[PDB]
Amino acid sequence: PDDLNAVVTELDKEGVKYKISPDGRTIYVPENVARELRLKLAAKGVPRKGIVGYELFDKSGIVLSRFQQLVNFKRAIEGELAKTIMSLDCVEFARVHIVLPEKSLFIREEEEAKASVFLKLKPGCELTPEQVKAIRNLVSGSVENLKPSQVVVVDD
Amino acid sequence: PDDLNAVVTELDKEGVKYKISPDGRTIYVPENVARELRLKLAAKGVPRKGIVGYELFDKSGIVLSRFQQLVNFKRAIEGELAKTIMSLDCVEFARVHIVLPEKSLFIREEEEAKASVFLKLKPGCELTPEQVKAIRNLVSGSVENLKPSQVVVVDD
């Protein structure tokens, strides 16, 4: 019962079909509701941004909204990249976040993207500059508007 | 494209509110009114490539909607995969399309996805069984919930 009280009590008033995951950190709300909650919660609670928007609700599951599908696909791409990075002996855990351009200038043909890689390394192990460079090229190789020099790798 | 003239007349009826770029394929429309739009002209209308949803507009550029950003990312991912497949040059042109899972049951994290690979080959060359398998592995390697067997490869 952590932090869920703030939203569920203000959503209990309207009376729309919502329910909490068996865990207790993932909520399921309509897409029109999730669109109002994603930006506000991202500034508030950060965990995996576990807010799922649906198009149709059922007791067994949900029909994902189109937006939620695209969100899930992005994180799936990032999860796969992180999985490859974790194949490194020194790397125990890895997380990849690709930053998408929010604007599009008519003066430019292409908008540049950014990317951050967070690594939990093995206590005694340490990455070489060539291995880090391999990481930058791996992530940037996924899309055309992302270059290795815009991929930042940090040890958290 | 003459298809654009069939969608600028569709909006000329609906709400009369749009923005045509100096480029002949790109059409700018607010996200809130592009939300109901793409659901309509889905069948025999547009591959929704030209339609771009924004939050704000001026003569120097636009603020991309979060939805549009995710849409562009998916196409960029597919475009990059297609670019790699086209590096064979036996394949003159390639189009990659990943179909996202529509449902999320409460007893399972994520369902399985599928993908279609549209290939345009040169009249002489023909794909080898090893190459086809490599194509399926390349596309399926993008996300965890996509298997090589669920990737169909066709020859346009």
Numbering used by the authors:
A (entry chain A), B (entry chain B): 58 to 213
The paper states:
The MS-ring is a transmembrane ring assembly of a single protein, FliF, and has a two-tier ring structure; the S-ring is an upper ring located in the periplasm, and the M-ring is a lower ring embedded in the inner membrane. FliF is a 60-kDa protein with a large periplasmic region between two transmembrane helices. The MS-ring provides a base for the assembly of the flagellar structure. Previous sequence analysis revealed that the periplasmic region of FliF has three ring-building motifs (RBMs), namely, RBM1, RBM2, and RBM3, which are conserved in SctJ/SctD, SctJ/SctD/SpoIIIAH, and SpoIIIAG, respectively.
Therefore, we prepared FliF fragments from a thermophilic bacterium, A. aeolicus, and determined the crystal structure of a fragment consisting of residues 58 to 213 (Aa-FliF58–213) at 2.3-Å resolution. The crystal belongs to the space group of H3 and contains two essentially identical molecules in an asymmetric unit (the root mean square deviation for Cα atoms is 0.694). The structure of Aa-FliF58–213 consists of two distinct domains corresponding to RBM1 (D1; Pro58 to Ser122) and RBM2 (D2; Arg123 to Asp213). The D1 domain (FliFD1) is a compact globular domain composed of two α-helices (α1 and α2) and five β-strands (β1 to β5). β1, β2, and β3 form a core β sheet flanked by the two α-helices and another β-sheet made up of β4 and β5. The D2 domain (FliFD2) is more elongated and consists of two α-helices (α3 and α4) and four β-strands (β6 to β8 and βi). An intramolecular disulfide bridge is formed between C147 and C182 at a pole of FliFD2 but is not essential for the FliF function, as discussed later. Aa-FliF58–213 forms a dimer related by a pseudo-2-fold symmetry in the crystal, and β4 and β5 form an intersubunit β sheet with βi of the dimer mate. However, the dimer is a crystal-packing artifact because FliF forms a ring structure, and the 2-fold symmetrical dimer cannot be fitted in the cryoEM density, as shown later. We found that FliFD1 shows structural similarity to both PrgKD1 and PrgHD2, although the N-terminal α-helix of FliFD1 (α1) is longer than the corresponding helix of PrgHD2. FliFD2 resembles both PrgKD2 and PrgHD3, which adopt a common RBM fold.
